[PDB]
Amino acid sequence: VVFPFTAIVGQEEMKLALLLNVIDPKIGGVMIMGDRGTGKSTTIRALADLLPEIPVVANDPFNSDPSDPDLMSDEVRQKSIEFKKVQMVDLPLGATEDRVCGTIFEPGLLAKANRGILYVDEVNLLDDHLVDVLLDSAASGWNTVEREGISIRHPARFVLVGSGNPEEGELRPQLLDRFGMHAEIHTVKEPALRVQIVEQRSEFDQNPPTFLEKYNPEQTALQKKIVEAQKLLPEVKLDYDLRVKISEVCSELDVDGLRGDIVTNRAAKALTAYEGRTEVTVDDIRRVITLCLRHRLRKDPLESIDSGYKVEKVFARIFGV
Amino acid sequence: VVFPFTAIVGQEEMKLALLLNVIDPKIGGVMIMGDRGTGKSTTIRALADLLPEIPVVANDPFNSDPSDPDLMSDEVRQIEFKKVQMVDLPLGATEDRVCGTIFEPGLLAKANRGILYVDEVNLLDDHLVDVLLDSAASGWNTVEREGISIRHPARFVLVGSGNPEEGELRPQLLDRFGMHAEIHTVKEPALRVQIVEQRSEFDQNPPTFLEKYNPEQTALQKKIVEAQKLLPEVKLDYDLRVKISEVCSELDVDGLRGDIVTNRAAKALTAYEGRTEVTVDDIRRVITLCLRHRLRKDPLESIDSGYKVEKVFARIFGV
Amino acid sequence: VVFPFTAIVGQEEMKLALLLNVIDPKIGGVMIMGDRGTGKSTTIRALADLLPEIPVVANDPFNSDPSDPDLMSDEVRQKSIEFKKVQMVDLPLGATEDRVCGTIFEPGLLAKANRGILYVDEVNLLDDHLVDVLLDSAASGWNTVEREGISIRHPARFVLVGSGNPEEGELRPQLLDRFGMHAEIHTVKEPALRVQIVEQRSEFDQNPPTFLEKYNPEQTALQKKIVEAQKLLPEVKLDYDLRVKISEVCSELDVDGLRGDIVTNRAAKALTAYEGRTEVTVDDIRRVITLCLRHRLRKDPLESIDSGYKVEKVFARIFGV
Amino acid sequence: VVFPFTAIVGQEEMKLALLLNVIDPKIGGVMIMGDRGTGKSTTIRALADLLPEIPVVANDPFNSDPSDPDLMSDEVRQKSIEFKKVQMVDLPLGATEDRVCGTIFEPGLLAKANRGILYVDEVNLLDDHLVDVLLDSAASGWNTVEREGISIRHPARFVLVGSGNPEEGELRPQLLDRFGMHAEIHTVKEPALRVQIVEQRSEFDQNPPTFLEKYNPEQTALQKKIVEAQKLLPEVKLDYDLRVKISEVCSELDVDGLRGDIVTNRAAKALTAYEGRTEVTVDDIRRVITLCLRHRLRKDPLESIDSGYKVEKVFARIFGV
Amino acid sequence: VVFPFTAIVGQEEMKLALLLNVIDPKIGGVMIMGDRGTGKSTTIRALADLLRGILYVDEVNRFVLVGSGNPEEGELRPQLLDRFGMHAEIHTVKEPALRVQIVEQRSEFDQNPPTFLEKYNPEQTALQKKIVEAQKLLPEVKLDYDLRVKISEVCSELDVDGLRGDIVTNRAAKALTAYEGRTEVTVDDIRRVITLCLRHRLRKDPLESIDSGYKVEKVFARIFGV
Amino acid sequence: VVFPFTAIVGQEEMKLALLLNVIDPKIGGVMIMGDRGTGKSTTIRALADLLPEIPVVANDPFNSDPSDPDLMSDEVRQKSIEFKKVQMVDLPLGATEDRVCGTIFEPGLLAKANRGILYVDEVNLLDDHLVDVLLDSAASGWNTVEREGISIRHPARFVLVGSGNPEEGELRPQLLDRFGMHAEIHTVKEPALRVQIVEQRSEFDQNPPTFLEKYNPEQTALQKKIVEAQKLLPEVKLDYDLRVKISEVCSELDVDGLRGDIVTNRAAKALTAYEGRTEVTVDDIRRVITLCLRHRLRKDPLESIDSGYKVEKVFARIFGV
Ligand SMILES: Nc1ncnc2c1ncn2[C@@H]1O[C@H](COP(=O)(O)OP(=O)(O)OP(=O)(O)O)[C@@H](O)[C@H]1O
Ligand SMILES: Nc1ncnc2c1ncn2[C@@H]1O[C@H](COP(=O)(O)OP(=O)(O)OP(=O)(O)O)[C@@H](O)[C@H]1O
Ligand SMILES: Nc1ncnc2c1ncn2[C@@H]1O[C@H](COP(=O)(O)OP(=O)(O)OP(=O)(O)O)[C@@H](O)[C@H]1O
Ligand SMILES: Nc1ncnc2c1ncn2[C@@H]1O[C@H](COP(=O)(O)OP(=O)(O)OP(=O)(O)O)[C@@H](O)[C@H]1O
Ligand SMILES: Nc1ncnc2c1ncn2[C@@H]1O[C@H](COP(=O)(O)OP(=O)(O)OP(=O)(O)O)[C@@H](O)[C@H]1O
Ligand SMILES: Nc1ncnc2c1ncn2[C@@H]1O[C@H](COP(=O)(O)OP(=O)(O)O)[C@@H](O)[C@H]1O
Ligand SMILES: [Mg+2]
Ligand SMILES: [Mg+2]
Ligand SMILES: [Mg+2]
Ligand SMILES: [Mg+2]
Ligand SMILES: [Mg+2]
């Protein structure tokens, strides 16, 4: 039993963030920000049942693929089947590295997290000491147990989601970077959508196994659209002039550089590419640049003005509207 | 024997809050606020006897039901009733006794289809409150450690208390909780003499005092048994459904998790009253006990929490 | 053997209250706070020869009672006479949980002391994790032996006495309300009393088993008096029209009011039994009302006042003795 | 081989109230708060050859007298030879309870100190740890030891020695009262005396086991005086007016309880036995009163006065010269 | 699985620092601090190949450990900040075209990893020889007494308490003019390492607004010569 | 395989203070402080190559000599030889209270420190950590440990030579007051000396054998000088006038305690033995006075007067010129 994905109401930006990162497991981690409730856990939980079946080998927690290039493991000695879905690998609050990585073999939490989706809890409460060690091993590619005199490395490539709390401050500016881009969640105030959410929740609760039937065609239409858009990635091209055009708008924001501009063009051919259109445009980048790369900024709290206005204003003049 | 449940005198708020929770074990847990030396603990233990007998499969530790789904833990793969046992955890107990690792589901399976509680949660040992609270709202359990998925259908209620002068709970957990109950100390000696009369007569005659109010307890048991089946008939009109949440929209309430409580409780209010259509006035008798612990969470001065919930709601619902 | 109880000079307040608890073991514990080196820690240890007899089970592994309606012993709920003196057991600040309850079963120090006096010294200096197993066990009735794959409930029905110094710290407010019927002791002023006490223990230290011989014919009669209060413990008369007066007082001090009233009602009537009368009197209450509920009154820390006087400050307003 | 006691020059104050406890191990503790290098830890260790011999039972279970009331050994008492000198033992700078109390039976360290001398070095240290254990055996003469399933009593009574630096804080006001004597040690301010100190010490380092031989009869002539004092300890009488004056003085100083006020009445008897007189005179009052009743003052840093000037002024105003 | 060595775009300051560190071990370790994400871990992992022992230190706030200090907090305690090599700041790229082809870089790496090395295989090859012969030059290089008395004069003028800033420079400036082929150290080749070195061990003492290299340039030019 | 001792250029304070200590193993170790990189730890490592040879007992359980009576540690007293090289002991900054002293045969660390040299690095740190337990053999000859049921005696007689930067802070008096040797290291500021000390650092690193062969004879000459000085150390006297002068300087300078005067006489005797002349006059009292007493003076908590000039201000004023 699980809640349907498309049955949710609103939350276009957050769902848009999932739509971008899900196709490419190389853009990086993605923060999601917002107040309590709002079904943040449900949405990512709703993400589980939208994908083609992924293959296992026999039972391994990594189970990336029975035949793939990066399969550095002792099982290759045997080399030299079944189809499953994604399993969410949420970790408890105040955990310890004894099972996240392991000791002197035993498996790890990140081992089960391989190729899946790792929903980490409130990172503001979590201490930096227990998370800095392999915060995202995808950049490293595989595991590293060089500590305590061990030499085992296994793949740990997967996507991250932050899900912080905007009540006890934010993470350190150094730690905020290298993750990815931001994501804001609003709060509905119109009673119509409120009562709609209440009615949908009550109807699902009353009839668990029959509600999803009324929302069946969308749950497969979206999956088919994503599957079709998956194969269009290695065909999109970007104009040389447009590539340098953005380079004259990031500098005025005093961006750290060399990674802020490497994620826009890494994800530019996903919003303009999943619609089926091959040639990139200018206005399409407009949507993907307002939120992405904005969270870097320069951490200037001594200012009271529309922060988003800063992103679009400098962007308009360089691109000439 | 124990204290009579109906023998409690002068308290109705927490009594009603517990009564609405006993009927349908789906609203959520209830916490109770007040003052020390008031008498909250005895009433909680008095509920352990007022109950209808519930059957079992084979007197298994899970002890949920002989029938009905969701009991897949070696219960419906292919017997007496007794009564529900209230489970109290000991002080200073970590996960070793909460769930164990090697199965021995102590303190949880015995609490499944039962009552579990703890007091003075305002400085309760941490790392433990989160584990049970998240699983209380969750379906069955979280025993994923050691690579095992034997998660037992630990479905029950949760009762907690504390002290409003020694500190409160984390805001990240209070808003996730259920109903909010607050009591006080009776200031009239005319009933305090009645209170001190009890605990001084029934002690020397428990066999005599067991039948002192037996007809009332039997009437209450039959009333709750009858009212259990009356709930799945109440209907709420569309206009009144959107009439609420106008105050919540006018006020500042975090999310909608604190809104479903009114819909899932107000219907149960008329379940044991014999009614089938909801009214306007009765809403004010249940809206106050919920969503009031959240408010605007801005404690800068002395603000009456009840005044904001009640006075504003009166204008919306026309007094 | 030890210092005779009746040889203590002065200190009427402490001597009047602590003996009153023997005749009725239903009231809770007792603690005394005051200046060090003033008379405590020896009078309490001198109460080992002032206790009557009580029934006892055959070999009594439960150590509570063989002839009561509620037994819940090891060999009562399954199986279904003797007289012994009630014992007093003291525990130091050296042991830990390993022996207070115990398991493999052997009983701990807590389990053996039933319906008696359990004396611990310097409860102010008592380390934590020890009072936690005593916060509510002594006020509930039974303990938990849930460890080691079994589950037993040894009884908790006794009275514990403590004696500390109010300079090294203060107890947690939960302890200050769990207790009841306590007293405070200051130093002596009259020089002749000082001469008397300095003579004492020096006339005594010359020959231990000679000083008690002089007081032997006088100390025995006390054992007769309290036994009389055992027969007069029931049948004590207290009109309901005075119960309102004993309860109106608490509302004026804004105390919890659900322990002071019960303790006063259960102790004032018993105070008459030791005397000999049957009908209580207003004057018979003013000598015990102040001693109780003193450790429960709440006062503003900025305000400085003596609770031992403020308790009976409003006494004149109610009926004025 | 240790430095002989009858070789320290100067410091007649400490040299008088240090061997006084040898007369009778009942006066109480002794404190010497002084600066470093003044020989505080040297003269104490010299006592190992200036104590008498006392009879004791065989096998030394707890070092208890054969014929004395209140033995309560619980192993040989129900059964109702060799005399030995007292023992010397010190505890190190910090330890655990395993040796202090006892465990696996195997006796603890405190058992050996019974009827002997135990001295603690750097008493300013060992705060809140391994100190509250030694807070019951003093001023009571008994303690209870139980853990790991073994429970045995301890008839332990002795006297204590305190020494350490004076500028490392203060001792907790619970172990302080268990010390019956206190002294202050200065450094000699005189050229001739100082150089005499220098020459006297170095002469011992040349040939150790010849220097003490030059002082053999001088130290032997000292033990006879203390032996005569011990033999003449009985028959010593004090006037009634002397008794009423030895306690009336403490009223003007407000001593924290009448716990240490009896030590002075137990000190004048010992000093008079040293010379040989029987009836205690006024002389043996001012020579000892300030030595013992000096650290029992609650004056605190509130007035411009220190040392024992207040004690001398009050004593002189009450009586004397 | 690895990133090319000579394909890294940089101001050559980090490259020269690490090259002088590897050409002679017993000089310490070049700490790097000033920014984050720019090139630190990539350069450090690049140094792990195409080469005694090499280590790495993170989150600061024969064996050589270059490490990578925390940029936000700065450095550690000045008393423990020593026992290392020269300290270098982090350059921030500004030219838009530089951003253009640096973001073009590693894109083809993502497209096809086990080919990028080949695209940079030949020229990088020459690098592994440019140091191999260099090691057979340091035993055959001398220095003049006039330069020896010239050195430690800058240290004497400043407060360089701790006699280690007059040995590491002579052990480093010697090595810089020991791999090109030249045998005599020029009067200006000293300037190529003194500005980089003597940075951490100057007892900063922030009593006035001071620049990193302004002092080490002005005081050096004041006496040593313009 | 280290820097030869007879090669340090400049800073003769070390090669006098630390070298002179080896003559008479009675004064405490050196308490040098200074900046880093100046060689404060280089010369200490060099002393390991130049040390005398003493005899020890068989198997050396506690580092004791065989021809030394009265050294009753554990077994020699009841029963009351290879001439092996002495050894200096060092400890890491990370340890535990049970690490230094032998516990559950199992010996300890100080067993190797008896009649040896003990080196401590950054002694200004490590507060309460292994320094409280290291006050036994300082100002005393024995250490008492009875932990875990086994009690022994330690004859440890180490030197306790310290080091450490002074930038962090000062020391609590108890630790520092046991040091008798104390130099003051200052960095060189002469270009010729700087280039000189730069020069020979290179060739020694290139070929240590050539450097040590070059600097061979001076080490042998120094060893012979030390041996002759130690042999001729006794039979050196002093007149009365110089002793009373050395008392007067300390008395007027007001040094706390008495350990100050003891050390200076031994230092002067050892220095005049190192020179070779039997008689001693006013030559070694002008040189080794501040170096043995400057650190002891701690009467300037607020005054800003240089410490080095203070001693010589009064010395020449009273003594001699
Ligand atoms: N789109 C939605 N808007 C509002 N409420 C929703 C939405 N979807 C689901 N809900 C309901 O809102 C309630 C709160 O959701 P949920 O418990 O998943 O919150 P959460 O994201 O885990 O909260 P928190 O941020 O406090 O950890 C649930 O009853 C859920 O069914
Ligand atoms: N209606 C009542 N009002 C007040 N007290 C009552 C009432 N009924 C019973 N009591 C008695 O009041 C006492 C309260 O005991 P209880 O264990 O409930 O503590 P409490 O006052 O709730 O506080 P605490 O949290 O400190 O235990 C009991 O002796 C109980 O029998
Ligand atoms: N009536 C009395 N008044 C005062 N002291 C008395 C009296 N009777 C006996 N004593 C003796 O006076 C001494 C007081 O010591 P005691 O142990 O009673 O002090 P305390 O108040 O318990 O101190 P602490 O708090 O330090 O343990 C004991 O030796 C005790 O025997
Ligand atoms: N009368 C004396 N006064 C002072 N010192 C003396 C005297 N006689 C001998 N000494 C010598 O003075 C030194 C004192 O050493 P000791 O450790 O006992 O002193 P202390 O005052 O107890 O020191 P600390 O307070 O630092 O523990 C020893 O070397 C001892 O031989
Ligand atoms: N007399 C001297 N003066 C200065 N430096 C010297 C001298 N003799 C040798 N050196 C060299 O100076 C350097 C100092 O090294 P070393 O680490 O021992 O110094 P340090 O001052 O003791 O350091 P630290 O305080 O950091 O422990 C070494 O290279 C050493 O060979
Ligand atoms: N030659 C180069 N010049 C500038 N930036 C580069 C170069 N090579 C890689 N980068 C960028 O540097 C980033 C690596 O950041 P890194 O320095 O490892 O972070 P951190 O400083 O936290 O270790 C990569 O994302 C890459 O885009
Ligand atoms: Mg959530
Ligand atoms: Mg309770
Ligand atoms: Mg006591
Ligand atoms: Mg000493
Ligand atoms: Mg060093």
Author numbering:
A (entry chain E), C (entry chain C), D (entry chain B), F (entry chain A): 14 to 93, 101 to 124, 137 to 353
B (entry chain D): 14 to 91, 101 to 124, 137 to 353
E (entry chain F): 14 to 64, 147 to 156, 189 to 353
Tell me, in the authors' exact words, what the paper reports:
Magnesium chelatase is a conserved enzyme complex responsible for the first committed step of chlorophyll biosynthesis in photosynthetic organisms, which is the addition of magnesium to the chlorophyll precursor, protoporphyrin IX. The complex is composed of the catalytic subunit ChlH, the bridging subunit ChlD, and the subunit ChlI, which serves as the motor that drives the entire complex. The motor subunit ChlI belongs to the superfamily of AAA+ (ATPases associated with diverse cellular activities) proteins and, through binding and hydrolyzing of ATP, provides the energy for the thermodynamically unfavorable reaction of Mg2+ insertion into protoporphyrin IX. Here, we used a combination of cryo-EM and functional analysis to investigate the mechanism of the ChlI motor subunit of magnesium chelatase from the cyanobacterium Nostoc sp. PCC 7120 (hereafter, Nostoc).
